[PDB]
Amino acid sequence: VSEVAVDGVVFPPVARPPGSGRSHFLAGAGVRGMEIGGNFIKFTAIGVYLEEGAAVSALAKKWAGKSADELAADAAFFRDVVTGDFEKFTRVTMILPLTGEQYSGKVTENCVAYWKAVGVYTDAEGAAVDKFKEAFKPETFPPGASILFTHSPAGVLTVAFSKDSSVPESGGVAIDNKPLCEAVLESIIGEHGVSPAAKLSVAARVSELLKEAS
């Protein structure tokens, strides 16, 4: 696949998550923002990488022969990407500066809000959120810094950090909680995913890769 540039952040076409031993291809990338003052403010650039070989083989079974527009409009496609039996890897690269405490507080607060509403919040998720916040607490992310998320096929979220766009080779903190692992990816590409740009990129690029497998 080709590289994708997002507002000064270059995402290479391949990634190797720290210590996973797998290679990924760039499924898609896009900016992520929040409405501030009635306008869209860009905060991060996000690249979504999927396991080479295994993601295409799994996704082709239900989504082969579908166009970019059809995949982009079908929330069940993105749900299949999130829950898929293959590794995923997300790189969040800062456009505006963020501190670990605020980023992790917001992510987890929103996860716990949902889980408890739908009554699936268990001690396990509370512990996973604590471990997630503990990993982010000492960290600050100037522009260009990155958060790296490995989403293992069984549902382990590994959290690592980088001062720039590069990916470390030594793994980060392993958080063995499938709900948190999927929620982090879901918050990006899900129905209410915070990056519509990333979602459109993934659907266009995966649609064309699915054609070379059929």
Numbering used by the authors: 4 to 217
Would you copy out the relevant sentences from the publication that reported this structure?
Based on the obtained X-ray crystal structures of CHS, CHI, and chalcone isomerase-like protein (CHIL) from the same monocotyledon, Panicum virgatum, along with the results of the steady-state kinetics, spectroscopic/thermodynamic analyses, intermolecular interactions, and their effect on each catalytic step are proposed. The production of these value-added products also offers the prospect of increasing the value of the crop, especially because many of these compounds are soluble and readily extracted. This study characterized the enzymes involved in the first two committed steps of the flavonoid pathway, CHS and CHI, and the non-catalytic protein CHIL. Through crystal structure, molecular docking, mutagenesis, kinetic analyses, ITC, and FRET analysis, our study provides evidence supporting a revised catalytic reaction mechanism for monocot CHS and CHI and identified an intermolecular interaction of CHS with both CHI and CHIL in a non-competitive manner.
The asymmetric unit contained two molecules of PvCHI that did not display any significant interaction between them. As predicted, PDBePISA calculated that interaction between two PvCHI molecules in the asymmetric unit was low with a ΔiG of 1.1 kcal mol−1 and a CSS of 0.00, indicating its likely monomeric nature in solution. Among 237 residues in the native PvCHI, the electron density corresponding to the residues from 4 to 217 and 4 to 216 of the A and B molecules, respectively, were resolved, indicating the disordered nature of both N- and C- terminals. The three-dimensional structure of PvCHI displayed an open-faced β-sandwich fold with six anti-parallel β-sheets (β1–β6) and seven α-helices (α1–α7). The observed temperature factors for residues 35–39 and those constituting the α4 helix in PvCHI were elevated compared to other residues, indicating the intrinsic flexibility that allows the substrate to enter with a plausible induced fit. In addition, in the apo-form crystal structures of both PvCHI and SbCHI, the sidechain of Arg-35 in PvCHI (Arg-34 in SbCHI) was positioned at the substrate-entrance site and hydrogen bonded to both Thr-47 and Tyr-190 through water-molecules. The substrate specificity of type I and II CHIs has previously been attributed to the difference between Ser-190 and Ile-191 in type II vs. Thr and Met, respectively, in type I. PvCHI has Ser-190/Ile-191 in the α6 region and displayed significant activity toward isoliquiritigenin. The reaction rates for varying concentrations of naringenin chalcone displayed a typical Michaelis–Menten kinetics with a Vmax of 8012 μM s−1 and a Km of 16.04 μM.
